[PDB]
């Protein structure tokens, strides 16, 4: 199956060598990137049926609820909105998807993947640092990534070698643009 034999090794190979106001913005940025992914799936309902019919993932809803919670323990909470950088990235995903649906899909995947892989350490240590009592809904593991990986395996069964090549190459680009959203 494509994920275990091709995607996960490729990601392994791709391994080489801040106030509360700011944290709320961080979550708003993440909410909007993930929301955009959900919108670009629905805007191509036919192409992405296996990820839709698989049924919605829970992460956007978790972040939504987590933004409401964190809003409650931030002064001037209604002032904060998505950052300049996030709105670039949202347009970039539109554009990516417009050009090549699998180029876009690689970027969605890596985003779900790298968030899963880093969320628990990040959100615990940020919420410690900023004295934010309640653990966030979006730090919980609810198989979003596993479900993503399940759908990749099924989609890859109807992909040309070329389409797989594009997807695996696109992981590099997505991995990099990931890091850049870490400040």
Numbering used by the authors: 95 to 111, 133 to 298
Q: How did the manuscript describe this experimental structure?
A:
Although this protein shows distant homology to HO enzymes, it lacks the strictly conserved active-site His ligand and does not degrade heme in vitro or in live cells. Heme oxygenases are ubiquitous enzymes that retain a conserved α-helical structure and canonically function in regioselective cleavage of the porphyrin macrocycle of heme to release iron. We have elucidated an essential role for PfHO within the apicoplast organelle of P. falciparum, where it associates with the apicoplast genome and nucleic acid metabolism enzymes and is required for organelle gene expression and apicoplast biogenesis.
As an initial step towards understanding this divergent function, we determined a 2.8 Å-resolution X-ray crystal structure of the HO-like domain of PfHO (residues 84–305) in its unliganded state, as we were unable to crystalize PfHO84-305 in the presence of bound heme. The structure obtained for apo-PfHO84-305 was highly α-helical with an overall fold expected for an HO homolog, including strong concordance in the positions of α-helix-forming sequences between PfHO, HuHO1, and SynHO1. Although the purified protein contained residues 84–305, electron density to support structural modeling began with residue 95 at the start of an α-helix, suggesting that residues 84–94 are disordered. Superposition of crystal structures for PfHO and SynHO1 revealed very similar α-helical folds, with a root-mean-square deviation (RMSD) in the positions of backbone atoms of 2.11 Å for the two structures. In contrast to the ordered distal helix, we were unable to resolve the structure of the C-terminal region of the proximal helix (residues 112–133) of PfHO due to weak electron density for these residues, possibly reflecting static or dynamic structural disorder in this region.
